[PDB]
Amino acid sequence: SGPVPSRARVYTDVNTHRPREYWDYESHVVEWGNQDDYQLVRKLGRGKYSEVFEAINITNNEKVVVKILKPVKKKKIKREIKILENLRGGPNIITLADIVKDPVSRTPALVFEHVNNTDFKQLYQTLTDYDIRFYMYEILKALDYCHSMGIMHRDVKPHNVMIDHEHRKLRLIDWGLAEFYHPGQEYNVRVASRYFKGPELLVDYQMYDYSLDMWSLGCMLASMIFRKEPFFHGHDNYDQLVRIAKVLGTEDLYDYIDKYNIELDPRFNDILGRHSRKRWERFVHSENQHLVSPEALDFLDKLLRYDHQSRLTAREAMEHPYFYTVVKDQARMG
Numbered sequence: 001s002g003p004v005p006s007r008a009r010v011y012t013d014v015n016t017h018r019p020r021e022y023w024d025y026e027s028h029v030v031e032w033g034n035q036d037d038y039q040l041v042r043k044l045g046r047g048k049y050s051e052v053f054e055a056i057n058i059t060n061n062e063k064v065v066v067k068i069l070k071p072v073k074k075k076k077i078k079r080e081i082k083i084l085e086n087l088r089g090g091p092n093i094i095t096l097a098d099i100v101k102d103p104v105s106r107t108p109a110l111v112f113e114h115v116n117n118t119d120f121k122q123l124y125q126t127l128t129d130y131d132i133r134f135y136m137y138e139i140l141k142a143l144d145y146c147h148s149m150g151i152m153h154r155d156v157k158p159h160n161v162m163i164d165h166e167h168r169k170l171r172l173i174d175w176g177l178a179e180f181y182h183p184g185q186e187y188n189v190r191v192a193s194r195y196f197k198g199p200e201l202l203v204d205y206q207m208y209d210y211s212l213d214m215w216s217l218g219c220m221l222a223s224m225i226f227r228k229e230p231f232f233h234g235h236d237n238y239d240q241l242v243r244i245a246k247v248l249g250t251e252d253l254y255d256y257i258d259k260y261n262i263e264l265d266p267r268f269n270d271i272l273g274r275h276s277r278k279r280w281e282r283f284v285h286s287e288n289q290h291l292v293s294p295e296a297l298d299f300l301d302k303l304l305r306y307d308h309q310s311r312l313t314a315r316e317a318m319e320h321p322y323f324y325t326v327v328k329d330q331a332r333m334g
């Protein structure tokens with residue numbers, strides 16, 4: 001039988017109509033600068049693919065962020081570099097300032113523009129109802145741009161959103177997992193963080209598209225308005241689907257499985273069970289009532305869908321009543 005093919009409802013062929021140089025990142029030539037132009041000041045943290053430092057550009061004494069890339073295939077380094085240059089100057093996208101290599105260790109490193117970020121473990125506890133709508137609108141500006149540019153982030157989560165709350169600025173960072181969308185291509189489902197993986201990654205459906213980012217965004221919105229971090233708290237990839245199925249119900253899950261003829265892992269046979277689709281009022285209590293509204297629930301409900309085709313696009317999300325007040329204040333400032 002095999003899975004049913006799928007295509008994105010928006011920006012399906014944008015990369016096809018580009019010159020081959022735009023998406024053929026393997027043939028991209030990189031001009032490696034000298035890392036001596038930067039002096040590391042502080043370690044801002046580290047992850048599985050890189051360790052991040054705050055550095056100073058000794059030529060003009062401006063703050064930058066140096067991200068020393070951990071050993072991955074050069075093909076994947078050019079991918080992140082090509083994507084960052086294609087998205088350069090876009091709304092709420094991090095700005096790649098330079099590409100350098102250590103003269104001694106010869107290790108590649110990326111240099112980004114500095115951001116004054118407050119970690120969401122201290123910031124999301126302080127966000128008002130308006131702040132969530134405002135910053136979600138900013139993330140949506142970034143997602144709509146890169147999707148329109150044929151690029152698919154595949155790792156949307158609070159750790160990858162730097163917010164300057166004093167200046168109300170926001171930047172979407174960490175594009176090491178981003179990929180170009182091409183209709184018909186089957187991608188690796190081993191992407192994104194566990195708590196933000198879309199159902200298509202959990203049931204191993206490889207022909208996904210930009211809508212994968214919209215599920216991750218719905219997981220962020222759910223945790224912010226309900227004050228439950230994370231919202232789907234699974235112990236592994238298989239239990240992650242059971243946590244989703246206990247909220248969105250199992251009826252729409254098996255309809256999704258049947259629609260795309262997805263071969264379900266036999267491990268899911270005994271753990272999914274049968275669950276109803278819970279109304280969002282079960283997650284509202286005295287601590288989060290000021291962040292929940294009929295608009296927030298209607299908007300959240302339209303993001304968290306099994307069928308990736310039925311999720312809102314980034315532009316459709318920006319047109320939701322949930323953002324009406326943010327759009328108006330933006331207009332007068334204009």
Ligand SMILES: Brc1nc2nn[nH]c2c(Br)c1Br
Nearest residue numbers: 044052065112113115117173
């Ligand atoms: Br500010 C800032 N903080 C980070 N923490 N991890 N990666 C980071 C990046 Br890229 C920037 Br820019």
